[PDB]
Amino acid sequence: GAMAPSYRVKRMDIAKNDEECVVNAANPRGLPGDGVCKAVYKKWPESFKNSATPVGTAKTVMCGTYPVIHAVGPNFSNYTESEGDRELAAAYREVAKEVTRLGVNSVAIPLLSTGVYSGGKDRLTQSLNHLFTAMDSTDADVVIYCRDKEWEKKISEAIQMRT
Ligand SMILES: N#CCc1nccn1CC(F)(F)F
Numbered sequence: 001g002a003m004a005p006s007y008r009v010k011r012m013d014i015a016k017n018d019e020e021c022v023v024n025a026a027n028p029r030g031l032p033g034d035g036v037c038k039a040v041y042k043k044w045p046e047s048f049k050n051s052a053t054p055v056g057t058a059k060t061v062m063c064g065t066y067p068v069i070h071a072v073g074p075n076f077s078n079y080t081e082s083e084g085d086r087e088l089a090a091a092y093r094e095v096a097k098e099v100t101r102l103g104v105n106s107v108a109i110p111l112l113s114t115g116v117y118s119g120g121k122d123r124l125t126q127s128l129n130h131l132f133t134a135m136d137s138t139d140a141d142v143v144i145y146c147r148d149k150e151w152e153k154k155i156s157e158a159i160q161m162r163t
């Protein structure tokens with residue numbers, strides 16, 4: 001575990017993370033995809049061997065000894081708000097199980113279902129609160145990655161609010 005488990009936020013490409021493992025915002029088919037998933041495919045392509053997994057699940061594949069946790073959030077274009085919310089919460093619970101199983105002291109994690117799977121809505125708060133619900137009982141240092149300047153400020157505020 002980390003000596004004083006923390007949350008932090010950085011605005012940069014998650015493929016350049018300084019953590020012991022990474023969470024990919026994967027598609028269910030283990031395809032290269034776009035956005036975070038394509039950056040992850042370029043950096044860790046070996047981790048896409050048998051990475052296909054259903055919505056609401058996470059599947060870890062090693063790239064050398066570096067773990068890539070493929071977490072499949074729902075595409076809100078296809079799910080109802082209710083069913084999508086349930087699958088988004090479930091994907092983060094499976095990430096917390098994998099992080100715990102791996103025994104890592106730190107994890108890099110993107111906000112699932114906030115980009116091309118958002119169904120054109122702002123889901124920062126919804127996705128971040130499901131992240132916290134899953135990760136708060138873990139003792140890994142969590143570093144959240146984002147690309148937008150206003151999102152960095154909102155995520156930083158949300159972390160600081162809990163102290
Ligand atoms: N509503 C929305 C999408 C949005 N705007 C700025 C950042 N984001 C998240 C995203 F970049 F799409 F992943």
Ligand SMILES: N#CCc1nccn1CC(F)(F)F
Binds near residue numbers: 078081119120
């Ligand atoms: N069939 C479907 C998707 C759906 N139904 C109601 C809301 N949504 C998602 C969206 F509104 F696009 F975010």
Ligand SMILES: [Cl-]
Binds near residue numbers: 016
């Ligand atoms: Cl960058």
Ligand SMILES: [Cl-]
Binds near residue numbers: 025113
């Ligand atoms: Cl997405």
Ligand SMILES: [Cl-]
Binds near residue numbers: 146151
């Ligand atoms: Cl972002």
